[PDB]
Paper text:
To elucidate underlying mechanisms, the cryo-EM structure of the DSR2-DSAD1 complex has been determined at 2.98 Å, with DSAD1 bound to DSR2A in the open state. In the structure, DSAD1 consists of strands β1 to β5 and one α helix between β4 and β5. Extensive interactions between DSAD1 and DSR2open consist of residues S18, I53, C57, D58, F59, E76, F79, and F81 of DSAD1 and residues K960, R802, W919, K965, N963, N863, S909, and S908 of DSR2open. In addition, the binding of DSAD1 introduces new contact with DSR2closed by DSAD1 residues K6, Y16, and S18 forming hydrogen bonds with DSR2closed residues S637 and I631 of CTD and residues G572 and Y574 of the MID. Compared to TTP binding of DSR2, the DSAD1 binding induces much slighter conformational change with an RMSD of 1.138 Å between the overall structures of the DSR2-DSAD1 complex and apo DSR2. Although the SIR2 domains within the DSR2-DSAD1 complex exhibit conformational twisting to a certain extent, the magnitude of twist is much smaller compared to the changes induced by TTP binding. This conformational change on the SIR2 domain tetramer is not harsh enough to hurt proper tetramerization conformation critical for its NADase activity. When superimposing TTP and DSAD1 simultaneously in one protomer, DSAD1 binds to DSR2open with the lifting α42 generating a wider binding pocket; the falling of α42 in the closed state clearly blocks the entry of DSAD1 like a door bolt. With the direct steric hindrance in the binding site occupied by DSAD1, it is impossible for TTP to bind to the same DSR2 protomer. The binding of DSAD1 locks DSR2open in the resting state, by not only competitively occupying the binding pocket but also stabilizing the MID of the adjacent protomer to stop the transduction of TTP-induced conformational changes in DSR2closed, allosterically inhibiting the activation on DSR2 NADase activity triggered by TTP binding.
As a sirtuin (SIR2) family protein, defense-associated sirtuin2 (DSR2) has been demonstrated to participate in bacterial anti-phage resistance via depleting nicotinamide adenine dinucleotide (NAD+) of infected cells, which can be activated by tail tube protein (TTP) and inhibited by DSR anti-defense 1 (DSAD1) of diverse phages. To defend phage invasion, Bacillus subtilis utilizes DSR2 proteins to sense and recognize phage SPR tail tube protein (TTP), then unleashes NADase activity of its SIR2 domain to deplete the cell of NAD+ and abort phage propagation during infection. Each DSR2 protomer contains three domains, an N-terminal SIR2 domain (SIR2, residues 1 to 297), a middle connector domain (MID, residues 297 to 627), and a C-terminal sensor domain (CTD, residues 627 to 1005). Structural analyses and biochemical studies reveal that DSR2 forms a tetramer with a SIR2 central core and two distinct conformations.
Numbering used by the authors:
A (entry chain B), C (entry chain A): 336 to 1005
B (entry chain C): 6 to 120
The structure:
């Protein structure tokens, strides 16, 4: 504590009263005449110091500080996700003990935790003769963290087992797990820095922080302060017209990533470090939304007219992918508008997303058994392909992003509902090329080839199914017929029951000759086929033959609703049929006046059928962001509805952080 | 513009007013000239009013660190505004940052919210 | 590490490779007869363990856990602020060396840091031969921590001088300052634990952290799992209590307080412990606000019958009063809705507020005070009377708080304007009954009687003055006469000119014979006398003799209008009085009809008197940022200006995102 070293390369002197020896050091840096007064045994101790600070970033003092131009370069293959370079670096021959410390970190990042524990173990035999000990102490830390990583797996592979990956599987043998709990059960990480020489202490006193959480403590305290003063400059409407107030949060972020990925520390896979990165970058985007929608009302800024803005570079796309979950991105997309943040270096967000799409087909096509590597990689591959809505992709790079999404993502993670969602996202910035319809067509002929069983059915959690891949084709290629599925719906017998239900969903994608072949086979005999039949352009107006099938469903619901009163529970379907009925009755699509007798079963049905006599204590505000343009502008016309879905929608403007409730309020109701 | 200080210059969008630590040398219509003036504005939308009060903001005019007792109609012509922290003479800039705000007192020294 | 002792009071096996004895110990506690089979000496060792675990709240096992409530009780006079009982304890004869340990902590909490340095130096002398070092080791920590308090006080006393402390000196003799610098030269707190006996380091290893520079480093990083990992917990839904990440963070706050106050550790007065309470209480209120708003999306607005999830009590009141500054309470008040936080135990919050009022009275209705006690206490007396907005107070308890806030609270911290801000907050959950008006009416008299000095003016940093106390009385008791102010205005001459100008602001408080004689100095002849007569003078009326000068200034401006255009001068740098006049017309306080024949001069005048014949493309939208709750309600009254200014608000909430234009548009215009 002789000099504050801030994160902008300035130096501020505090807690010093003797000779100022950093002030005299930067006087040596600027001039050459103060050199050559140096001893030759001391001048060679200067080029090492001058290269030390030009590598690290300590430029000058606080007084003689001009520009604050500081870029960033994390030169580490693990930060960039070069997987096939690491495999060729582990197959290469060992050279030193520094090249094996950089090796054992790479096997850990690849999920080879059995062999990386063994490789850190050999470094502990060898590094005493290194006379430095920093390779020793950092390998003692990193080996203990690999150990703690193989305990949370075996209490989750042998604990959960079924719902994670197939059955109860064993990535680690029973011999290994038993033996490592014997070699390192007397270990105490709290006494690893104390059980080392006094030459390693006081020359590496900044490394006692790596044993515990107190290497994050000074940044967590500065997040929690700079959060509170950005939020309070945003709840005040104040716009500073100089440097950004969270440039500390950006520079202090990239120090923690260039410390831990360069020095090859397995503390990059923590929860507490992942949680520091996302809270740091949620604040940088919440302020970036705040600053691009500003208004001075003074014909622009005169002196601050050349102000630059926050924009996504390559390093910001990687820090959202590794460190956010999807619910972390869902909040950031409903609070902010990422579709108006401009993204830069689109050419090298390609190679990160092509690289993820190539490491997911190099282990879900062949014998990719490393479920240890699958544990943390698939949470990055999910958050990257989801956040790829905002980048523009080339057609040869989009093609293998889509072919890896549809065929090689496991259904344990990404079922068929949220596999459609992440396909419709990739079409927003990229108008859908012709060589990608040929990938959906190779996916629709494959699900048909799986429906030859009578025991195979699609499981979704969103209510989205293989229909919706076909409306997406018929969204961009309005005159497109398949030649391969039409060669399947031409051969249709009575013993193919699950086949023929499936292709009746996909009817506007089949040919003109073969649409007649299946509709003459089976027809509407259900209300589950009526919901299918409306959206595929077969039933242009309701006939009374369909409505009696509706009321037959509503009656058998009502008879079930009577016996529901004795059991006292409430269980719905996957796709709620009851709310679809009320929208048809409210839009004057059904002319029947007999469905008021069904009021009292489901709450959304009661709002549309009876807008006059509805109790608005049970109106869910999440309903309003499910409606289209026409239905929402008809709730704005009903005088029984308009002045009550204002107070639902006024309180969601000021209390929630969704931006949808403004756009519903302004475009339709005000 | 040129290389001005512009470091504590903030824009409050709630009451349309600049805030940066300057001093004024104002001159009225024909009354007198005053030295080292600065304004303080206070945003009080929840205030027990008369039957004539209409504003959300109220301005105290300060003359030397003590409050000016207003006795005349207040015409302000900034003869010379000067910056305090950087000692530059920001006189012509505060003129033309004032018509494109279209508020009573565009530059103040502090803004107090809800008193 | 054989067991987890979780914060509920429960016990979990962790690494007990051995006999299960804590599993066995609670089998002895449940039975009454099986423990009547033990030895003689080893039976009183059971009663001592049964008292320890009940006093520290280790209840049972976790596999056989019950449904038991775990309420917090901190038994400490220094937590509750029982200052007069602490002083009666310092003036009693010490039996033990543990009572001198408690006195030396109460001396520090009362601010008399010289007596506490000497009393810790006394204990270290008398407690080397003690066979346990707890009174010795902790007196050596607390002596060093109170040396850090003296060295950081004598810095900040000379940083302010006399303008803040008000004593114009420093309370430490150089015979005390240069003594303790000689006694604490090279006193390393690090070598303290590793230089105590070997039996201390085995028995008390848990006390090692108090010699560290920064503890609480693990608890701060565990605040990351609190407020912002519930982004993902609401995808499946978070619930009420259930020992959720809410309860774990709150109970580890209550353990760190009960450890540091019952063991009398002075590290409870530092910035690292105050920032921990701030960072962990602010982030439990932001979490409960997040879980409330997400439970209004998925569920309904009436499905949550409670107000909010975070229910405060007495210990949560005192932790916000003692540890938060007022710029930190204001961050909670924007980032939550503390109107939705119900405070419990309001008979205990009242007894804490009356008791701060008793100490502010005792410190400053007296010539005796500290400047060391006053600097730490007045930040808590400010935060506690500010946060008492949300507490129902009794009539005999509020009256003791208002007398300590208006008369005895020092003006160096609360000026005349900030006392009004905090008196008005006390009238929200309460009101003003007939007994609290008589305290303000004794404050205006004491402020009337001080303004007869010719060199006295009120200094107020909010813009609020003695005018505003009088507006608060009349807002509740509309018919009120100040018989001591109405006996100082008719016993009043022109000999004291300033008190004439004081009582100009207090006209609706005075009597008819008072308003007769105090209006004897109001000379309204020019329109310069009109505007301060209506703004400042409280004329509260509009004679035609008032309005006749307005027409004359209008007509001379109309005479100036023909040279307004022929000379090219159009600048009105607050040269208006003219936007003000149309607002008086539009509020129906100017009963002229000939005003509208003068509507061509000011654009803002042209809107208020001629709404119907107005060119709305001349509307400056910033005008609605100068209009109050009075006037904005009347623009939502006029049928001619309602639909026009909705379009000027919607073009400013769609193009920019100004949260003030949206607050106007929603609270008044919909």
């Amino acid at each position: 504590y002789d000099y504050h070293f801030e994160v902008n390369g300035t130096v501020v002197r505090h807690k010093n009263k003797g000779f100022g020896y950093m002030e005299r050091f930067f006087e040596l840096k600027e001039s050459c005449d103060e050199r050559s007064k140096l001893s030759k045994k001391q001048y060679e101790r200067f080029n090492a110091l001058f290269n030390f600070f030009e590598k690290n970033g300590v430029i000058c003092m606080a007084k003689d500080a001009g520009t604050l131009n500081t870029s960033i370069e994390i030169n580490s293959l693990a930060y960039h996700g070069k997987y096939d370079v690491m495999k060729k670096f582990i197959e290469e021959q060992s050279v030193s003990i520094e090249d094996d410390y950089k090796k054992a970190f790479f096997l850990a990042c690849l999920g080879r935790w059995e062999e990386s524990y063994d490789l850190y173990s050999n470094i502990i035999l060898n590094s005493i003769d290194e006379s430095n000990g920093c390779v020793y102490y950092l390998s003692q830390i990193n080996r203990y963290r690999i150990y703690q990583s193989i305990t949370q797996a075996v209490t989750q592979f042998n604990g959960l087992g079924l719902l994670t990956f197939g059955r109860h599987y064993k990535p680690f043998t029973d011999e290994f797990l038993a033996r490592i709990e014997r070699e390192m059960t007397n270990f105490n990480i709290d006494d690893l820095f104390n059980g080392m020489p006094f030459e390693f202490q006081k020359k590496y006193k900044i490394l006692e922080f790596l044993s515990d959480n107190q290497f994050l403590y000074d940044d967590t305290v500065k997040l929690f302060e700079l959060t509170n003063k950005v939020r309070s400059e945003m709840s005040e409407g104040s716009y500073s017209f100089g440097m950004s107030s969270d440039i500390v949060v950006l520079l202090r972020l990239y120090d923690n990533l260039r410390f831990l990925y360069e020095n090859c520390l397995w503390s990059v896979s923590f929860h507490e470090f992942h949680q520091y990165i996302r809270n740091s970058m949620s604040l940088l985007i919440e302020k970036a939304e705040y600053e691009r929608t500003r208004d001075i009302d003074e014909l622009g800024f005169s002196f601050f007219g050349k102000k630059s803005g926050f924009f996504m570079e390559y390093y910001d796309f990687v820090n959202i992918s590794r460190h956010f979950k999807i619910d972390d991105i869902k909040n950031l997309e409903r609070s902010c508008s990422i579709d108006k943040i401009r993204f830069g270096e689109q050419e090298k967000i390609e190679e990160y997303l092509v690289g993820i799409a190539e490491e997911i087909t190099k282990q879900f096509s062949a014998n990719g058994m490393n479920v240890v590597f699958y544990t943390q990689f698939i949470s990055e591959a999910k958050a990257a392909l989801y956040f790829a809505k905002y980048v523009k992709l080339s057609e040869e790079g989009l093609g293998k992003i889509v072919k890896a999404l549809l065929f090689y993502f496991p259904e344990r993670d990404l079922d068929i509902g949220k596999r459609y969602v992440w396909l419709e996202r990739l079409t927003k910035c990229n108008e859908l090329p012709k060589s990608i319809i040929s990938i959906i067509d190779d996916f629709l002929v494959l699900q048909a080839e799986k429906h030859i069983d009578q025991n195979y059915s699609e499981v979704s959690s969103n209510g989205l199914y293989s229909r919706d891949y076909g409306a997406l084709i018929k969204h961009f290629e309005k005159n497109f017929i398949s030649k391969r599925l039409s060669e399947i719906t031409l051969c249709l017998t009575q013993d193919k029951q699950k086949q023929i239900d499936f292709l009746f969903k996909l009817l506007p994608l089949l040919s003109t000759n073969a649409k007649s072949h299946l509709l003459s086979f089976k027809s509407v005999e259900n209300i589950n086929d009526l919901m299918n039949g409306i959206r595929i352009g077969l039933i242009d107006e309701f006939t009374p033959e369909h409505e009696e099938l509706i009321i037959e469903y509503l009656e058998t619901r009502k008879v079930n609703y009577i016996v529901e009163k004795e059991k006292g529970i409430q269980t719905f379907s996957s796709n709620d049929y009851m709310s679809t009925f009320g929208i048809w009755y409210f839009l004057e699509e059904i002319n029947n006046s007999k469905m008021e007798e069904f009021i009292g079963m489901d709450d959304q049905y009661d709002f549309f059928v009876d807008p006059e006599n509805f109790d608005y204590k049970k109106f869910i505000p999440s309903w309003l962001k499910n409606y289209n343009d026409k239905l929402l502008g008809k709730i704005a016309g009903n005088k029984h509805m308009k002045h009550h879905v204002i107070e639902v929608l006024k309180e969601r403007v000021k209390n929630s952080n969704d931006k949808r409730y403004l756009e519903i309020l302004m475009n339709y109701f005000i | 513009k040129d290389t001005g200080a512009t470091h504590d210059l903030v824009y409050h969008s709630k009451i349309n007013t600049f805030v940066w630590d300057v001093e004024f040398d104002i001159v009225l219509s024909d009354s007198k000239e005053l030295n080292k003036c600065y304004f303080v504005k206070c945003f009080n939308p929840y205030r027990i009013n008369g039957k004539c009060d209409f504003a959300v903001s109220s301005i105290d005019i300060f003359s030397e660190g003590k409050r000016l007792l207003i006795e005349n109609e207040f015409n302000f012509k900034i003869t010379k505004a000067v910056h305090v922290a950087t000692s530059k003479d920001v006189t012509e800039i505060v003129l033309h940052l004032s018509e494109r705000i279209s508020s009573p007192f565009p530059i103040v020294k502090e803004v107090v919210y809800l008193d």
